[PDB]
Structure formats: structure tokens, C-alpha cells
Amino acid sequence: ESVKEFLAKAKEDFLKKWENPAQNTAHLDQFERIKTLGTGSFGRVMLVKHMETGNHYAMKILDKQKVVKLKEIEHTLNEKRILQAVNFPFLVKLEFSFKDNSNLYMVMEYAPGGEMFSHLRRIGRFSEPHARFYAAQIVLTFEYLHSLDLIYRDLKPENLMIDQQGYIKVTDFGLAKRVKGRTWTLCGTPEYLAPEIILSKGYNKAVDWWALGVLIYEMAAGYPPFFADQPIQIYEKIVSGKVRFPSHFSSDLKDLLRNLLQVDLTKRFGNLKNGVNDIKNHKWFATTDWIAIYQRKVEAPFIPKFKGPGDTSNFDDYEEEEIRVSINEKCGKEFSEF
């Protein structure tokens, strides 16, 4: 019933799937490809329809050659191994995965409400209650992921899908990693990077809590706390850490954000002995029923308009490309475990 209650069995389930991942559970010819919903470095996500069931899904297609070239094999293997092992209401569900001579495929649940990013940019900013509804789901999601020793490392509105009920599905696990203790890769999105990432220090799950501070600020303000035209200028602002707030931010919101956007690790909320409860019991979340959120019993502030299955009105248009499959297998050993 509560998230903590769920965690007992959930960790056991996750570890079993993590240790013995599912492979090769569909084939490309089982899906009709409809429309591109998004792109990334090595490919794209398309709306597809599973011909046997008629169900719609969001299929990520990655070009193996492009991945190897840019030396991102391990991160792509992390993405799939983690996604196939997790199970949480606010995470996109992986339904199938497979590979062919050219590409890697992950067939995920389709979130027809589109990206939070789209709605946030259009509307400008969210009210504090609206932002708080979303933030609470992220707090619960990180409680889950962190309990499994997973760091997510790419929180931003672009990666927070909205489902038919107005709830979040976190997607794009390309930077997610299972690590006990510290890791060192300089990765993430500039606006969302914790100072310790930028300073090449070694870092832990506390970076996700820093990023939560950036997300809540951006949701409530309409712009992130640190922005500039060049990433290097953004990094300088982050390490300096001198956040200023809009005058419309409540006192409680500002206090929470000062504790999340905390450069000092012995002081950052989410990274103290009391863990997630420093955040859950903060005054800004006084109206939040954590069990009701987890059980999706709270009426969402925003429900996307949805004109039947396969409608994509909540997504931007992208240039379409033919999916090419070589007659020769590419990079087979590198992606053996996929």
C-alpha cells in the first residue's frame, strides 16, 4: 500500500531480473511504425502498433554502429538492463526488447500526454500545487530507484512523460546506472548537473536530489535556476551556487530549494541520515498524501486532451527516416547481452 511496503518484494523482484535479464522478446515485423515522437544521439522513439494485439507502444530504435563510434556501449547496455528490471507506477514500462543486424529496439509503454517539457514551455510556469503534484511522484520514484542502488542522472521535463490520467512516467534511462558508492562519469544535462559532477569529484545518488531542486525551480519559475547560452557559462553559475528566486515563490518553496540546491553534501536534503524523509516531511509538502500519490488517487491538475488510440497531438513533429537493416550483422559481440 505504501511505497516502503512495496519496496521489500520489489527489491527482490528487481535483483532477480537484473541478474538474469530478458532478451529477444519480440521482432521488428510484429509492429507497424507510425510516427517519430522524439530523437536522440543514436536514434529515435516512434509510435508503433503491435499488429497482433492492436496495442500502441513507443519504440526506441538505436543504431549500433553510432553507439560504438561515440563510445556509449556501456550506457546503452545499462539503459536496457535497468529498464527491463524495474517496475514502478511512475516509470515507463518496457514491454519488449530485441535487436537485429543494425539496430537495438526497446518497445516501451506509450505515454500519450506528451513530454512535461512541451506543456511547461507552452503554459510558461506551473502553480506551486501543480509543480508539487509532479515533484511528489519524482520523490517517490527516486526513493524506489535509489533503494535498488540506481542513480537516474537525467532528470528534466524532457524525460517526464504525462500519461492519460495526468501522472508522470519517467523515460530515457540512458544515463541510469547501478552503483554502490561513488561514480565518475561527466554526464547529464548542463542545467541539471550537480556541482560535484562538474568538479570531477566522484559522486553518488545525491546528484538526483540536486536535480530535483532544479526541476522544481524550473516547474515553478518557468526557467531553470542556472541558464546561459554556453554550457561552460552554466557550469560556472552552478559551482558558484548563488541561486536567486522569483518573488512569487512561497517561503516554504524557497526553503526546500535552498536545501536541495545545496553545494555541501553533508547538508543536501536527500543525502542526510534521515534520507527521503527530510524532503517528504518538509513544510512545502504538508498537503501531500504520499500514499494517495503512490496509489494514483489524487486528481491530477492537468489531464491531456487525447483523441483516441495512436493520436499524437501532444507531440511535436519530427522528420521521418526509413529504418535500415543491413544484410550483415554489426557489432554483435559488443551488444551480446542486449
Partner: peptide
């Protein structure tokens, strides 16, 4: 205003990750 400065910036579209 800060909002106007943001909207005039080069970082209001979808943001890419950086990566090793």
C-alpha cells in the same frame, strides 16, 4: 525580466545530455 531573458536565450528548446 528573468523570464524575458530566458525566452531570448538559446536554451529554451529540448536540451541534450553531455556524455562520456
Amino acid at each position: 525580466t528573468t523570464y524575458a531573458d530566458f525566452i531570448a536565450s538559446g536554451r529554451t528548446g529540448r536540451r541534450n545530455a553531455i556524455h562520456d
